[PDB]
UniProtKB/Swiss-Prot annotation, chain A:
Domain spans labelled HTH cro/C1-type: 7-61
Annotated coiled-coil segments of the chain: none
Superkingdom to which the source organism belongs: Viruses
Protein name per UniProt: Repressor protein C2
Post-translational modifications: In the mature form of the repressor protein the initiator methionine is deformylated.
Protein's job: This protein allows the phage to reside inactively in the chromosome of its host bacterium. This lysogenic state is maintained by binding of regulatory protein C2 to the OR and OL operators, preventing transcription of proteins necessary for lytic development.
DNA-binding region per Swiss-Prot/TrEMBL record: 18-37
Curated annotation (Swiss-Prot), chain B:
Disulfide pattern: none
Ranges for domain HTH cro/C1-type: 9-63
The encoding gene: C2
GO MF annotation list: DNA binding
Function summary: This protein allows the phage to reside inactively in the chromosome of its host bacterium. This lysogenic state is maintained by binding of regulatory protein C2 to the OR and OL operators, preventing transcription of proteins necessary for lytic development.
Portion annotated as DNA-binding: 20-39
Name of the protein in question: Repressor protein C2
Record PTM: In the mature form of the repressor protein the initiator methionine is deformylated.
Domain of life: Viruses
DNA sequence: CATTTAAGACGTCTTAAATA
DNA sequence: TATTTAAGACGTCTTAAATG
C-alpha cells in the first residue's frame, strides 16, 4: 500500500476536500492530488504538516507504520 | 530555537561525534546530501527527514523548526 | 464541483573534483 | 579523511486549463 493511498484514506475519514486539506497543510489542492496519486511525495516540512492535519504520525504515512 | 535547521543538524551530529559520511550511511543518503542540509543548501525530503531524525535521536519537529 | 493534467520554475538528490 | 563545490538527473511544487 502506497503512502498516497493512506493520505487519501485519512482525508476521507476526516470528510474533507483536497483543497481544504491543502489549506491546512500550506500547499495547493494539486499538491494533495499529486501525493494521493503517488505522482510525488511530500517534502520534509510538508510531510510533518500533513501528518498533523491528518492526526497521525509521519511514520504511519510513510510506511503504514 | 531560531537557528536554521542546518545548524541544528550539524550541532547534533557533532555532539554524537558522527562524521557526515557515516551519518549519510545511517540515513540512506550521500555525505554530500548531509553537507547540503547542514549548510542549508537544501532540506531533507519526507523520507529522509524521518530517517535523519531517528539517526540523531531527535524529533523531526526539533530539526525542522527548533520546537 | 472537485479533482487530474500539463507545463514550467525551482528543490533535492547523485558522482567527480577541488579544497585543505 | 573530511568536507565543500560543481554539474547534472530527476523530484516537488505552482497556476491555468481540462476533465470530471
Amino acid at each position: 500500500q502506497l503512502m498516497g493511498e493512506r493520505i487519501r484514506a485519512r482525508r476521507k475519514k476526516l470528510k474533507i476536500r483536497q483543497a481544504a486539506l491543502g489549506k491546512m497543510v500550506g500547499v495547493s489542492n494539486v499538491a494533495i492530488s499529486q501525493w494521493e496519486r503517488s505522482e510525488t511525495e511530500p517534502n520534509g516540512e510538508n510531510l510533518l504538516a500533513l501528518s498533523k492535519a491528518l492526526q497521525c504520525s509521519p511514520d504511519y504515512l510513510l510506511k503504514g507504520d
